[PDB]
From a paper:
In bacteria, Ser/Thr protein kinase-like sequences are found as part of large multidomain polypeptides that biosynthesize lanthipeptides, a class of natural products distinguished by the presence of thioether cross-links. The kinase domain phosphorylates Ser or Thr residues in the peptide substrates. Subsequent β-elimination by a lyase domain yields electrophilic dehydroamino acids, which can undergo cyclase domain-catalyzed cyclization to yield conformationally restricted, bioactive compounds. We also describe the first crystal structures of a class III lanthipeptide synthetase, consisting of the lyase, kinase, and cyclase domains, in various states including complexes with its leader peptide and nucleotide.
Leader peptide residues Asp(−10) to Met(−22) are bound perpendicular to the antiparallel β-strands that form the N-lobe of the kinase domain. A comparison with the structure of wild-type ThurKC bound to the leader peptide in trans (2.45 Å resolution) confirms the binding mode and rules out artifactual binding due to the single-chain fusion. The leader region binds as a three turn α-helix, encompassing residues Lys(−14) through Met(−22), and the helical configuration is consistent with prior multidimensional NMR studies of the synthetic leader peptides of class III lipolanthine from M. arborescens (MicA from the microvionin pathway). The remainder of the leader sequence (Leu(−13) through Asp(−10)) exists in an extended form and is directed toward the kinase and lyase active sites. The leader helix is amphipathic in nature with the hydrophobic residues directed toward contacts with the ThurKC and most of the polar residues facing toward the solvent. The leader binding groove in ThurKC is formed by several aromatic or aliphatic residues from both the kinase and the lyase domains that provide van der Waals contact with the peptide. The last of the helical residues from the leader that contacts the protein is Gln(−15), and this residue is engaged in hydrogen bonding interactions with Tyr243 and Glu258 from the kinase domain and Arg112 from the lyase domain. Notably, an aromatic residue located at the very start of the kinase domain (Phe236) disrupts the helical configuration, resulting in the remainder of the leader being extended as a coil that may enable shuttling between the different actives sites of ThurKC. The structures of ThurKC bound to the leader peptide, either as a single-chain fusion or in trans, identify the correct binding site for the leader in a class III system, which is distinct from previously predicted models. Comparison of the ThurKC structure in the absence and presence of the leader peptide demonstrates that leader binding orients interactions between all three domains.
Numbering used by the authors:
A (entry chain A): -29 to -16
B (entry chain B): 4 to 23, 29 to 213, 223 to 862
């Protein structure tokens, strides 16, 4: 569960 | 860049520090209680005992109100257990570390706890969760691991100071004995204490597969915003994360409020198809995701950037006129629509309005939505589109539109501190470039808003009279009146003048040539003005402080200052200072701004003045250092948030200035080819425009840049100077394409480095007298957007025209130097070199 919610903060940029 | 908010002391025309306590005593012994240089932290120190070279540290997270108790509770289960800790010293500190726009890696960290070692660690975890079990769950620390279900977090990292040359923070490893410190939005364990980490991992005890989630748009301490795609559709949508007790604003409201206020007031405004509509809302995990109706297009700012015409294209501003017509007309009723729900849009500006490929307008983002007629102080104020004399909610919404009306016609930011003066400037500009037609449209729409404000509160504005402000095109007239301006605004503090915020934010900024007193001191000395004021300041401030400026930088540090000192007759002092520079450091920074090139340029100019070969020898040694540094990697690391690694200030173009200059004094052809090459490598990162005929540079961040800092004007200065030393006429075709920037209509800001002031340099490079006049006259049009009549004289707006500044970087000194360049036909006159009035003649072929 919180493996996604926190893994989102990790996600893509430019 | 958001730092400018911090410097808006009310009732000042200048950038000035906004001044604003977590109490506690029953303080035991060798509990030394101190602050810092001027940080957020308050250290509670015990005894005297080596706390490890790094270790496992505990952070307690808290929320704003609880905070006062959370400290008293943890401080005692730390005082009685005689443990060492620090906490954020006051309310202002807590706000800044937890605010909407705090860095993610550092937020939530309210109290830090340093246990002697791993047993008392894996036991303070225990004895602290317990004392704070009955306290509201505060902001989650993203850099740390959470302990069980508590406000207690832990991470491995440094307990004091560990730095890798210039390489951020660290922790001494074993073989490498350095390991930089991973402060990041995730939990990034070391490796050499991996052992103890896994131990803790087993003692620590489909609603988003609903959508695919590719890209992230923006982050921010409140949460994130993502590029989603709901299958069961393919309906691309925008998801708004909201971490509770996180991104605080100025009202004590967390990132929960501004999702259930972007709810209470997204609800009432479902009945308007300009406005945004929601998908759902839910408490997934501990967070929240209010899914938003996606809207293709661009924000107004992005539209302005790409579509507003900047090149003097001779007929076709009407194109943009109808567009400002299509858009603003709607928005005017779209705000009328909203107001029959009883709810205020809260924060109206070109960011929060969008525009498709057919000019459809919609208002996104509702964190600020309020009740019309209510005067609670608003959440986030967007300076440049607000004023602190509107008392009532509704009024503020319309004032935003008012200011925004003109903004789309002439996109130049201003604040309610300077708007008094510059309204004159922009209206006259608009009248001049659009016609009386468009001017009239604007005036009324702005009197319209005045109506819709009088509906809400007492608001009698002052009236017109454009004739009260006229352009000045006489260079000598402008110089003199800017000088008097500077003379009229001498602080009598250490700074000598009010400049950019970098005066307070950056090492040596109160003294150095770029934002400090040296820059105005220098300029006043060129116009043989305010001699005793300059002497007083040199004598009783500068000399005392000189040995304490850590940086050697030409703009940022000692070398610019040494130029002033030498030109003032203080040869001895420069002499002694150079004895110390020869060793000071051979750094990895080669920039003109702050690096070996800028320093080397100064050194050469001192060699020219003194004819003392020790300085030539020093220039050659500096070259050898630059060469090697150039070899270390074809990249440039950065410090100043406005810097970029192209152009004359922070780029290889500026490195070339040094090589040209060194050419002039050696007669060694090798340096000349390094100069040409360094230019060349910069020209490679230019973008010539096919439509309009203008060369600009292109940054990493995919900005197109004209300016002296980062842009093509700087590149040109480097070409002009290569040519000047060698006798050639290289890059004549790229040179011509840059001077075409003379035809620019407007810039967002006014300053030498980052604004309109850049363009002043264009004329000093034109060899013709005949095209110099047309060109000069164009850039003076640009400048007159920014020139402010005040009493008998002129003053100059700083960055974003929120406040005045007299400094070289943004203020009138930068401009005075540029205008004197034009006169002298010297595009390098803004450089702080020794006897720079002979420099050109001495470097000429």
């Amino acid at each position: 569960a919180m493996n996604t919610v926190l893994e989102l903060q990790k996600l893509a940029h430019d | 860049n958001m730092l400018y908010h911090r410097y808006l002391k009310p009732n000042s025309e200048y950038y000035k520090k906004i001044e604003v306590i977590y109490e506690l005593n029953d303080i035991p012994d060798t509990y030394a209680v101190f602050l810092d240089n001027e940080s957020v932290w308050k250290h509670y120190h015990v005894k005297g005992s080596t706390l490890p070279e790094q270790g496992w540290k505990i952070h307690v997270t808290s929320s704003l109100e609880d905070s006062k108790d959370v400290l008293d509770k943890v401080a005692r289960l730390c005082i009685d257990k005689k443990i060492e800790f620090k906490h954020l010293k006051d309310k202002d500190s807590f706000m800044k570390m937890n605010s909407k726009n705090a860095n993610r890696a550092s937020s939530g960290k309210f109290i830090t706890i340093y246990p002697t070692n791993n047993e008392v660690f894996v036991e303070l975890l225990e004895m602290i969760s317990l004392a704070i079990q009955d306290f509201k769950k505060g902001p989650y620390i993203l850099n740390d691991k959470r302990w069980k279900n508590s406000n207690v977090f832990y991470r491995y990292g440094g307990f004091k100071g560990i730095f890798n040359e210039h390489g951020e923070h660290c922790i001494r490893d074993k073989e490498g004995n350095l390991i930089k410190d991973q402060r990041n939005p995730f939990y990034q364990v070391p490796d050499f204490v991996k052992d103890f980490d896994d131990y803790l991992n087993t003692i620590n005890n489909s609603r988003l597969g609903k959508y695919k989630i590719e890209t992230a748009l923006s982050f921010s301490n409140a949460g994130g915003v993502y590029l989603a795609t709901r299958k069961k559709d393919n309906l691309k949508v925008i998801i708004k994360e909201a971490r509770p007790s996180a991104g605080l604003d100025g009202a004590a409201q967390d990132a929960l409020a501004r999702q259930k206020i972007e709810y209470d007031a997204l609800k009432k405004l479902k009945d308007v198809s300009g406005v945004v509509n929601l998908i759902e809302y839910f408490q997934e995990w501990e967070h929240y995701f209010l899914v938003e109706e996606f809207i293709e297009g661009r924000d107004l700012r992005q539209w302005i950037a790409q579509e507003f015409p900047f090149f003097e294209d001779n007929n076709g501003m009407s194109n943009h006129i109808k567009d400002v017509k299509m858009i603003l007309l709607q928005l005017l009723d779209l705000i009328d629509s909203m107001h029959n729900q009883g709810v205020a849009m809260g924060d109206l500006q070109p960011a929060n309005i969008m525009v498709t490929e057919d000019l459809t307008v919609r208002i996104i983002d509702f964190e600020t939505a309020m009740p019309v007629n209510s005067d609670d102080r608003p959440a986030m104020l967007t300076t440049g589109f607000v004023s602190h004399e509107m008392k009532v909610s509704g009024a503020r919404d319309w004032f935003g539109f008012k200011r925004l009306v003109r903004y789309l016609a002439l996109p130049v930011l201003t604040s309610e501190d300077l708007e008094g003066y510059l309204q004159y400037n922009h209206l006259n500009w608009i009248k001049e470039n659009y016609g009386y037609e468009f001017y009239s449209f604007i005036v009324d729409l702005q009197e319209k808003c005045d109506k819709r404000i009088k509906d809400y509160q007492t608001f009698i504005p002052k009236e017109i009279n454009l004739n009260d402000q006229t352009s000045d095109f006489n260079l000598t007239s402008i110089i003199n009146k800017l000088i008097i301006g500077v003379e009229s605004s001498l602080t009598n503090d250490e700074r000598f003048i009010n400049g950019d915020i970098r005066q307070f934010e950056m090492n040596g900024g109160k003294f150095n040539f770029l934002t400090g007193g040296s820059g105005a001191a220098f300029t006043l000395t060129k116009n043989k003005s305010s001699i005793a004021e300059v002497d007083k300041w040199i004598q009783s401030v500068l000399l005392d402080n000189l040995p304490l400026i850590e940086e050697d930088g030409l703009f940022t540090g000692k070398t610019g200052i040494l130029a002033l000192l030498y030109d003032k007759g203080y040869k001895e002092v420069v002499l002694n200072e150079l004895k110390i520079l020869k060793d000071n450091i051979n750094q990895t920074d080669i920039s003109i701004r702050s690096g070996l090139s800028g320093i080397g340029l100064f050194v050469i100019s001192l060699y020219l003045e003194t004819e003392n070969k020790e300085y030539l020898k020093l220039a050659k040694d500096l070259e050898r250092m630059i060469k090697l540094n150039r070899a270390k990697d074809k990249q440039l690391k950065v410090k100043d948030w406005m810097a970029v690694d192209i152009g004359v200030i922070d780029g290889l173009s500026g490195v070339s200035l040094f090589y040209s200059a060194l050419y002039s004094v050696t007669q060694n052809q090798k340096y000349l080819e390094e100069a040409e090459v360094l230019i060349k490598e910069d020209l490679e990162s230019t973008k010539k425009d096919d439509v309009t005929g203008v060369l600009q540079t292109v940054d990493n961040k995919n900005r197109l840049l004209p300016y002296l800092s980062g842009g093509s004007i700087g590149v040109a200065i480097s070409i002009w100077f290569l040519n000047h030393v060698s006798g050639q006429d290289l890059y004549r075709e790229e040179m011509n394409s840059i001077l075409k920037l003379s035809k620019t209509r407007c810039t967002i800001s006014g300053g030498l480095f980052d604004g309109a002031g850049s363009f002043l340099l264009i004329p000093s490079m034109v060899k013709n007298d005949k095209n110099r006049e047309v060109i000069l006259n164009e850039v003076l049009n640009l400048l007159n957007i920014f020139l402010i009549e005040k009493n008998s004289y002129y003053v100059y707006p700083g960055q974003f025209s929120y406040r005045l500044a007299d400094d070289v970087y943004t203020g009138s000194s930068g401009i005075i130097l540029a205008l004197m360049g034009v006169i002298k036909g010297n595009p390098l006159y803004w450089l702080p070199l020794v006897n720079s009035d002979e420099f050109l003649a001495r470097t000429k072929v």
